[PDB]
């Protein structure tokens, strides 16, 4: 199962 | 960062003339990911060659397996033709049953 | 014994040829089990191994949404990277990610990973401590500061210590017939005379899983590491892998050479000789 990482952007 | 593909052409099982098998072309170590691979039977392009889904290694370089069912015979020559941005001309690698 | 789960992202721009393509593949060890491709007619997470198919509809819809959201996020990431590196909008560029966990025989976290690359170069990675970042350059330092501010490392750590290991445990049980089965190599030595006074001895390992293997030639019990030609381990197409190692030896002196094969599907540690 994947990680739903919140508001993660470069 | 551009990396030229490594190429191996080989069979799934040890080659015996007249026995059904799979011809593989494994391209690896390349970057970027766009690549053209044909499998050749006596110079001509084999149709409905399939491939694996695009993946990459720990070093970020890409790899792909292209393959087709085939029945090797004594006379028919088989080969892989690869093109990538790193190659000025398509690279042809012949199938050698001992490699 | 020991096992891994990794997800691999590629996001690749293609100016003049639509919006950037986003692909995710998931592996347990050397087994692909799930894929997403934003270019698909109906983009969604698709099963690629039998044992994952028994996950329920909620699983598949949750997973598909993660990737659909990531297609949009990574398109934004690519736009952002152009700015960070002062690059024009006319070139094709690639963001890669690999993340996941390694677990030991007891199913406990050995280590977690969350690594990113831009154009095939390291960009930012979560350190083994699961609490700090290594940025490769001053652009990646901008991302690091953003992720420090938002406590991204803490969320990563929670995933890697919890859901990553818990789901891998479940997959290993559901797929135990294949994922927990090591296939030993089938091994032989072939003989190819180069000339009158040298020959190639090629030691072959076929049909093995997982890919990890050691093939070594020894001359009089001494490793021939500088003089062994070794091909990259290659997929056979049936889940299994192949590899060979070759030495060029003087004719008549063939029996001075032994091929040594280590693989978790072995025993022992095999020793092979050319058998005329």
Alpha carbon of A4: minimum distance to chain C alpha carbons (Å): 6
CB B64 within 8 A of CB B27: yes
Helix (H, G, I), strand (E, B) or coil at C46: strand
- Of B28, B23, B25, the C-alpha closest to B5 is B28
Last residue within a domain, chosen from C181, C204, C228: C181
Q: Does C76 lie in the same domain as C164?
A: yes
Query: Are residues A3 and C67, on separate chains, in Cβ contact within 8 Å?
Result: no
Query: Are residues C146 and A9, on separate chains, in Cβ contact within 8 Å?
Result: yes
User: Mutate which of C11, C115, C159 to disrupt the A interface (most A C-beta within 10 Å)?
Assistant: C159
Q: Tell me how many degrees the CA angle B72-B73-B77 measures, rounded to the nearest 5.
A: 80
Helix (H, G, I), strand (E, B) or coil at C16: coil
* Closest residue on chain B to C240 (Cα): B12
Domain around C210: 182-272
Beta bridge partners of B27: B7, B64
CATH assignment of the domain containing C205 = 2.60.40.10
Q: Does C64 lie in the same domain as C8?
A: yes
Span B1-99: which CATH code?
2.60.40.10
The H-or-E segment that residue C156 falls in is helix C152-161
Q: Does C223 lie in the same domain as C164?
A: no
- Burial label for C70, CB within 10 Å (0-12, 13-18, 19+), is buried
Structure tokens at C257: 């050479």
Q: Tell me, letter by letter, the H, E, C secondary structure of C180-225.
A: CCCECCEEEEEEEECCCCEEEEEEEEEEEECCCCEEEEEECCEECC
CB B20 within 8 A of CB B91: no
Touching partners of C (3+ C-beta pairs < 8 Å) = A, B
CA gap C249, B27 in Å, rounded: 30
CB A5 within 8 A of CB C79: no
Beta bridge partners of C188: C204
Q: Does C119 lie in the same domain as C54?
A: yes
Residue C130: DSSP 8-state: S
Alpha carbon of B16: minimum distance to chain C alpha carbons (Å): 15
Left, alpha or beta for B71 (phi > 0: left; psi -120 to 50: alpha)? beta
Q: Does C218 lie in the same domain as C133?
A: no
Q: Between chain B and chain C, how many beta carbons pairs sit less than 8 Å apart?
A: 68
CB C15 within 8 A of CB C21: no
Contacts of residue C77 in chain A, CB cutoff 8 Å?
9-10
CB C149 within 8 A of CB C158: no
CA gap B45, B42 in Å, rounded: 9
Query: Are residues C163 and A1, on separate chains, in Cβ contact within 8 Å?
Result: yes
- Of B21, B28, B24, the C-alpha closest to B10 is B24
- Of C114, C106, C252, the C-alpha closest to C172 is C106
User: Mutate which of B5, B7, B39, B56 to disrupt the C interface (most C C-beta within 10 Å)?
Assistant: B56
CA gap B82, B18 in Å, rounded: 27
Beta bridge partners of C24: C9, C36
Residues in chain C, total: 276
CB C135 within 8 A of CB C148: no
Technique that determined the structure: X-ray
Q: Rg (Cα) of chain B, in Å, rounded?
A: 14
CA gap C89, C83 in Å, rounded: 10
CB C260 within 8 A of CB C218: yes
Alpha carbon of A7: minimum distance to chain C alpha carbons (Å): 8
Helix (H, G, I), strand (E, B) or coil at C257: strand
Cα C156 to Cα C99, C100, C160: the distances in Å are 10, 10, 6
- Of C210, C192, C209, the C-alpha closest to C201 is C192
The torsion defined by the Cα of C164, C166, C171 and C172, in degrees rounded to 10, comes to 110
Residues 1-10 of A with CB under 8 A from C: 1-10
Cα C76 to Cα B97, C10, C23, C183: the distances in Å are 48, 14, 15, 43
Last residue within a domain, chosen from C157, C181, C205: C181
Q: Does C155 lie in the same domain as C47?
A: yes
CB of B83 less than 8 A from some CB of C = no
CATH assignment of the domain containing C135 = 3.30.500.10
CB nearest to A4's CB, from C66, C143, C164: C66
Last residue within a domain, chosen from C153, C181, C209: C181
- Burial label for C264, CB within 10 Å (0-12, 13-18, 19+), is middle
CB of B21 less than 8 A from some CB of C = no
- Of C130, C114, C74, the C-alpha closest to A10 is C74
Q: Does C245 lie in the same domain as C119?
A: no
Q: Tell me, letter by letter, the H, E, C secondary structure of chain B.
A: CCECCEEEEEECCCCCCCCCEEEEEEEEEEECCCCEEEEEECCEECCCCEECCCEECCCCCEEEEEEEEECCCCCCCEEEEEECCCCCCCEEEECCCCC
**Residue ranges of domains in chain B:** 1-99
Q: Does C125 lie in the same domain as C199?
A: no
Beta bridge partners of C217: C259
Q: Tell me how many degrees the CA angle C107-C261-C236 measures, rounded to the nearest 5.
A: 75
CA gap C113, B58 in Å, rounded: 11
CB nearest to C25's CB, from B12, B31, B53: B53
Domain count, chain C: 2
Alpha carbon of B90: minimum distance to chain C alpha carbons (Å): 21
- Of C206, C207, C229, the C-alpha closest to C216 is C229
Left, alpha or beta for C168 (phi > 0: left; psi -120 to 50: alpha)? alpha
- Of C134, C139, C21, the C-alpha closest to C86 is C139
CB C128 within 8 A of CB C114: no
Q: Does C202 lie in the same domain as C104?
A: no
Phi, psi of B98, rounded to the nearest 5 degrees: -95, 5
Q: Where are the beta strands (DSSP E) in C69-164?
A: 94-103, 109-118, 121-126, 133-135
């Amino acid at each position: 199962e994947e990680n739903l990482l919140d508001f993660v952007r470069f | 960062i551009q990396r030229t593909p490594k190429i191996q052409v080989y069979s799934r099982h040890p080659a015996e003339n007249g026995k059904s098998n799979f011809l593989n072309c494994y391209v690896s170590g390349f970057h970027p990911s766009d690549i053209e691979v044909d499998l050749l039977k006596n110079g001509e392009r084999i149709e409905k060659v399939e491939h694996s889904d695009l993946s990459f290694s720990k070093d970020w370089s890409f790899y792909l397996l292209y393959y087709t069912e085939f029945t090797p015979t004594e006379k028919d020559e088989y080969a892989c033709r690869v093109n990538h941005v790193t190659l000025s001309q398509p690279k042809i690698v012949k199938w050698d049953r001992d490699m | 014994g020991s096992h891994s789960m990794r997800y691999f992202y590629t996001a690749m721009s293609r100016p003049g040829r639509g919006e950037p393509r986003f692909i995710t593949v998931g592996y347990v060890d050397d087994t692909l089990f799930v894929r997403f491709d934003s270019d698909a007619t109906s983009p969604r997470k698709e099963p690629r191994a039998p044992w994952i198919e028994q996950e329920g509809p909620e699983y598949w819809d949750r997973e598909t949404q993660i990737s659909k959201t990531n297609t949009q996020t990574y398109r934004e990431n690519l736009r952002t990277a152009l700015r960070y590196y002062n690059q024009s909008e006319a070139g094709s560029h690639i963001i890669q990610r690999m993340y996941g966990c390694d677990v030991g025989p007891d199913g406990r976290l050995l280590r977690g990973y969350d690594q990113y690359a831009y154009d095939g170069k390291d960009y930012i990675a979560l350190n083994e401590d699961l609490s700090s970042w290594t940025a490769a350059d001053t652009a990646a330092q901008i991302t690091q500061r953003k992720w420090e501010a938002a406590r991204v490392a803490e969320q990563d750590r929670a995933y890697l210590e919890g859901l990553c290991v818990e789901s891998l445990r479940r997959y290993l049980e559901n797929g135990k017939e294949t994922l927990q089965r090591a296939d030993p190599p089938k091994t032989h030595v072939t003989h190819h005379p180069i000339s009158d006074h040298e020959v190639t001895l090629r030691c072959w390992a076929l049909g093995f899983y997982p890919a990890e293997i050691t093939l070594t030639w020894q001359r009089d019990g001494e490793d021939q590491t500088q003089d062994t030609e070794l091909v990259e381990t290659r997929p056979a197409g049936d889940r299994t892998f192949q590899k060979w190692a070759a030495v060029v030896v003087p004719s008549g002196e063939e029996q001075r050479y032994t091929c040594h094969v280590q693989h978790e599907g072995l025993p022992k540690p095999l020793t092979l000789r050319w058998e005329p």
